[PDB]
Amino acid sequence: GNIILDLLLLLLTIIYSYLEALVKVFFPRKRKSVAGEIVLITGAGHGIGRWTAYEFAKQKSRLVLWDINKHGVEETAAECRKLGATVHTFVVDCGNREDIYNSVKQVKKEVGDVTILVNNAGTVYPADLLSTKDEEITKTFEINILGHFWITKALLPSMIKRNHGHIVTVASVCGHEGIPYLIPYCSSKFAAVGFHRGLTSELQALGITGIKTSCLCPVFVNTGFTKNPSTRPVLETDTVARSLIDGILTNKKMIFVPSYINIFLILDKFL
């Protein structure tokens, strides 16, 4: 019975589909080049991080990959090398502040000064507020938003000198609206969306032009991060990476995946 009312939403998503693809062709945004840039990607051992390193390797960039999974990040670097990119990896606990700072100095003593940051890394512990463990909540924030500050903080001094960079904050639709069982996770993803919103307002207020900001906000991505989605599309690992590579190149502030989820958030502010 509920499927009858659901066709109104289905018609508006196909309405946005032709409308968005018409703007991407009729009056399209200026695509830039990321060739020879120092692109650091945290959580690049699998999924959205792994396929972002594949997309940057296609653009002829200088990759630096960070992860806790030594094997996973090494295998991503292996397939990024098989594309022609210069790739150098480091096993970094992207939630630990003293490890991040320790590895930033090794990045400058080996690769140089990072010019593009991809704060992809994340952790999820799906449970109701009363069954979630305190350690899980702490680890959620430590990786999803606290860690974003230390990476951003250690690379921004150099991007400020050169007035050239790009801070990519990878968050989810759980940064625009909360879902059940993921309250600690949604709270951290909302914080990530606000950190990019404040970074964008403060970069602008300080006269900084050269440093752009992009925020990836997709729905369920088939990566194994969780088991099944929360509500009745499941984006693929590679489809999301193509959306992120295309959003960084046009310098878009909010990369919604799939884009129509912007009109759904508009309708939320009408009760």
Place this chain on the structure above:
Amino acid sequence: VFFPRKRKSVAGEIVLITGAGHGIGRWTAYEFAKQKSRLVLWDINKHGVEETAAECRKLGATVHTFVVDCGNREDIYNSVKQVKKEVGDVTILVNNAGTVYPADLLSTKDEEITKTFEINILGHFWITKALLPSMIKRNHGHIVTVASVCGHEGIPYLIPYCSSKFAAVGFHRGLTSELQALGITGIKTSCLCPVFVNTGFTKNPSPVLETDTVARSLIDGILTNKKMIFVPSYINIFLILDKF
């Protein structure tokens, strides 16, 4: 305006208010004392929270104070057991407490960022997590998350603060959706989102509201069970225009 929202009574309820030694917290305890509530105040400032309780007592309310570091998890849990061994089971929570360290991302201290999150959102999980089971049992409560317009859109110099306030607005939104998904009706949620309030929290504004005006907006939003208490109410249409 024509047929406006149903105002409820909060008389005889157990209202816990964190960060109630001054400003938005102090004037919320004054407004609840007017509503004839049983009050419980938490703060790090022993003198400030005792003086709020003193003026709340001079109104007729029964106020009990506890000096609690509302950012420390083991202190919060330790004091929740003292709240149940003295007052009883809390029925209304006011997550007011907050800390701000106004600076650019490169001049902010790491300790400041840590303390920002520890008070503004990490602390909001432990107090709610410990007061929620009895509320769940009784199917009656109200979780008030005090956030700022820095939870809907980021401002310069307050990036660590805006990041935590956004998290508070999302915790409220996630809690709301999960409360609904689990069949719980009796537990309502309100989120206070005002602009610059003259309290001395921050030196200069980012209209500028007064200490007491914001407290009246919060007391009126809890009584009508409104999910988003924007102060002032029109700042909702300004956020709509931002997505254009």
